[PDB]
């Protein structure tokens, strides 16, 4: 048999809009405070 | 030199303009366009011999060269002056560089030949089959400048591994691999081709197993 999910030519796609990549909540186990020192 | 361009034009008029239209165009459904392919493309396609060809078939195969190195520079500089594209790498003599192209590494060339293209040919650079009649050729009878200009401007069905896809360090590195994989001897016996198990089978039967059955019929009788 032919597989069911194929063969559909619409208008051939908008050009893919520029990848405004979201930031990363994989690193996010950490909060950048004012810093670390002695004083 | 303009006389070198004229020599390229004199050889161009009397070998190909039945299939390149004499304005470096493409004669439609008889021979494709030729500008932009460049001196590197014409060096690989006439220095191997292939493109001064005789039929449009599955793929135009290898053959003896139809012009010599004193004329390939003329023909390639003519096609680069009419068009313009990749050029053949040349040494400090002005001639085509063929020995300064072997890179200083082989293992990087082994991994890069193996990843990027050895799907098509083979591990050591023997031929491989392709889709409809076309086929990859052996890399044994391959001048290193022809290997660099083979991957640099991909003639027939091979991707043109460009100056920016593979860097010239990487391309010198691949031609370091294939000129010391199709040149190094098969360590440990006759090399039954380069591709393993089918010649090893056919040389198991008629060399090993035919000898085994011949010994078995010399020892035992028949009744």
């Amino acid at each position: 048999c032919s597989p069911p999910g194929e063969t559909a030519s619409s208008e051939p796609g908008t050009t893919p809009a520029i990848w405004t990549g979201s930031p990363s909540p994989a690193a996010p186990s950490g909060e950048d405070h004012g810093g670390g020192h002695g004083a | 030199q303009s006389a070198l361009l004229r020599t390229g034009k004199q050889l161009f008029e009397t070998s190909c303009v039945s299939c390149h239209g004499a304005n470096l165009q493409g004669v439609p459904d008889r021979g494709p366009s030729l500008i932009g392919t460049g001196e590197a493309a014409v060096y690989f396609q006439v220095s191997t011999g292939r493109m001064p060809a005789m039929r449009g078939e599955a793929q135009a195969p290898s053959k003896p060269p139809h012009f010599d190195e004193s004329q390939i520079d003329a023909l390639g500089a003519y096609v680069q002056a009419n068009g313009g594209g990749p050029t053949v790498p040349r040494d400090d003599h002005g001639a085509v560089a063929q020995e300064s192209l072997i890179g200083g590494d082989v293992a990087r060339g082994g991994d890069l030949f193996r990843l990027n293209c050895a799907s098509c040919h083979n591990f050591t650079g023997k031929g491989g089959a392709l889709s409809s009649g076309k086929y990859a050729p052996d890399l044994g009878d391959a001048n290193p400048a022809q290997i660099y200009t083979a991957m640099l401007t991909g003639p027939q069905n091979m991707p043109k591994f460009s100056d920016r896809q593979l860097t010239p360090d990487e391309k010198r590195d691949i031609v370091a691999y294939v000129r010391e994989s199709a040149e190094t001897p098969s360590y440990g016996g006759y090399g039954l081709g380069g591709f393993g198990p089918a010649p090893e089978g056919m040389a198991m039967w008629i060399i090993g197993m035919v000898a085994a059955i011949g010994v078995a019929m010399w020892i035992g009788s028949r009744a």
Partner: protein, 535 residues
């Protein structure tokens, strides 16, 4: 102190044990001296090589998938990521003294093993050595072929050179995922993870040193016990009735030629393990799942399998929310052919009606449809193999690759029919060719008839002759009848001297008279035994 100590130690062995009864039963056992009855011995005699090399290969090979940079001697693989299976297989190839030779003669012994199993299956098939008393012997030999095939496939995949790593990806993981209900489950049970699951190569090493060759050694032991105690079969001939084995005994003759044939099989394997490269894993790469060859073909005894992948024409099914892929079919198909190759003697016991205890063989011309079904299977194997190097055939023998896989795809449907027709009628015409050598004689040179102009071929008869130009026509007896007077005692007396210088004539007379009288005594003793059986 060389024969007296032999007698003392022999009386010691006969004192401790009581072996001499069950030793005399062994070294008076008769094996027949037909040449084809040595063929399966090759499948034994290379297999011992597969231990004697293979044990040696166990104590240098390190299976893993822990990714190591090479940092050894082989220059085109330096700093490249490789599994430690491939790294220590490279160490077998290049570090150890005589290591590449032992692993190459190991691979060639594997090829001679899995090829002589097929040659011997052709022997015992076409000669009919599988009906009633020996059908379980066929079954355990067939299972031994299956284990040989799967175990060799575990073998050359055991270093993960990528020419066989893509063989694991095609065969052992594309067909295994491609099984409908419990396919993915047996895949993830076989690998423990994804396709480069880190416990595949040690599991193949576990199955490949011991777990499959333990079953192979057990089946070879029980198999040669079934050949040993249950007596060997034989072709029918002069003094060869249903209930005797004629030939040489074990102790003076058969042990010598069997050990010498073991030595010459080892000689052929050693010569072709040195003089011919096999599995050049340094020319190949470490298995990385983004790079392939163009060949990507398995070893030849399994080239009929994925050649069957290469020829099965992309028929997939899609039930309600699922997928049967192509790889189910050959998973059926390899399950099909094996179920025809294990269970064949029961199949033709049902079809023919052979409910009789057969000990004498049948010559493969004497049984034309079974020889023709067999030649269907031989030529179908040759087609599925010869369209598995589809790639390199279309490479070298310049054919369109699509054209030669269509040649295979039609060939597996029409070429068994062609070879069935040719095989059946060729077996019948081989019958008729040695059923006219009885009604007529054996053909020779031509005499003309004297008073008129004729041309007779001057047939030489085999049995008793009548008073005129025709003999008494003999009956057929399942024997190879000689079709050349050459192979009879005609002109077979050259100079006995040397290759360069003759011996004196009285010595020639003594030698040829003694050899002629010994051959006459051979056929006289065999003929009087044949008359003792019927008279």
């Amino acid at each position: 102190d060389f024969a007296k100590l032999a007698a003392a130690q022999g009386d010691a062995i006969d004192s401790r044990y009581h072996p001499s009864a069950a030793v005399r039963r062994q070294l008076n056992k008769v094996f027949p001296t037909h040449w084809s009855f040595l063929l399966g011995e090759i499948a034994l005699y290379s297999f011992i090589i597969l231990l004697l090399t293979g044990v040696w290969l166990t104590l240098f090979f390190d299976p893993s998938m822990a990714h190591v940079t090479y940092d050894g001697v082989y220059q085109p693989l330096r700093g490249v990521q490789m599994s430690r299976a491939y790294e220590t297989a490279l160490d077998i190839s290049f570090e150890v003294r005589g290591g590449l030779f032992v692993r190459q003669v190991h691979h060639w012994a594997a090829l001679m093993f899995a090829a002589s199993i097929m040659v011997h299956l052709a022997r015992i098939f076409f000669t009919g050595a599988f009906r009633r008393p020996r059908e379980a012997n066929w079954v355990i030999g067939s299972l031994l072929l299956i284990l040989a095939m799967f175990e060799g496939f575990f073998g050359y995949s055991l270093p993960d050179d990528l020419l066989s790593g893509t063989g694991i990806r095609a065969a052992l993981s594309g067909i295994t995922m491609g099984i409908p209900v419990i396919g993915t489950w047996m895949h993830w049970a076989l690998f423990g993870g994804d396709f480069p699951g880190e416990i595949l190569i040690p599991r193949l090493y576990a199955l490949h040193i011991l777990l499959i060759p333990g079953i192979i050694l057990a089946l070879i032991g029980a198999h040669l016990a079934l050949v040993w105690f249950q007596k060997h079969t034989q072709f029918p001939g002069p003094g060869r009735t249903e209930t005797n084995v004629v030939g040489v005994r074990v102790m003076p003759v058969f042990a010598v030629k069997s050990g010498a044939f073991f030595a010459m099989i080892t000689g052929v394997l050693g010569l072709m393990g040195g003089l011919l490269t096999i599995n050049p894993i340094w020319n190949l790469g470490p298995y990385k799942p983004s790079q392939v060859s163009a060949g990507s073909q398995p070893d030849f005894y399994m080239m009929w399998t994925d050649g069957l992948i290469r020829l099965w024409p992309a028929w997939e099914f899609y039930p309600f929310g699922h997928t049967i892929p192509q790889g189910v079919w050959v998973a059926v198909g390899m399950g099909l052919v094996f179920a025809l190759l294990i269970a064949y003697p029961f199949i033709e016991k049902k079809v023919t009606g052979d409910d009789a205890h057969h000990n004498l063989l049948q010559r493969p011309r004497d049984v034309p449809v079974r020889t023709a079904i067999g030649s269907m299977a031989i030529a179908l194997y040759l087609l599925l193999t010869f369209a598995c190097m589809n790639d390199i055939i279309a490479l070298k023998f310049h054919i369109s690759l699509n054209a030669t896989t269509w040649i295979g795809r039609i060939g597996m449907v029409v070429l068994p029919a062609i070879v069935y027709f040719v095989a059946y009628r060729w077996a019948i015409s081989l019958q008729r060719s040695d059923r006219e050598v009885l009604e007529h004689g054996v053909e020779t040179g031509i005499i003309k008839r004297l008073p008129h102009g004729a041309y007779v071929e001057l047939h030489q008869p085999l049995g008793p002759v009548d008073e005129h130009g025709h003999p008494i026509p003999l009956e057929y007896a399942g024997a190879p009848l000689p079709k050349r007077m050459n192979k009879l005692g005609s002109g077979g007396a050259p100079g006995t001297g040397s290759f360069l210088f003759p011996d004196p004539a009285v010595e020639h007379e003594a030698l040829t008279e003694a050899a002629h009288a010994s051959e006459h005594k051979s056929l006289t003793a065999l003929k009087e035994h044949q008359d003792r059986i019927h008279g």
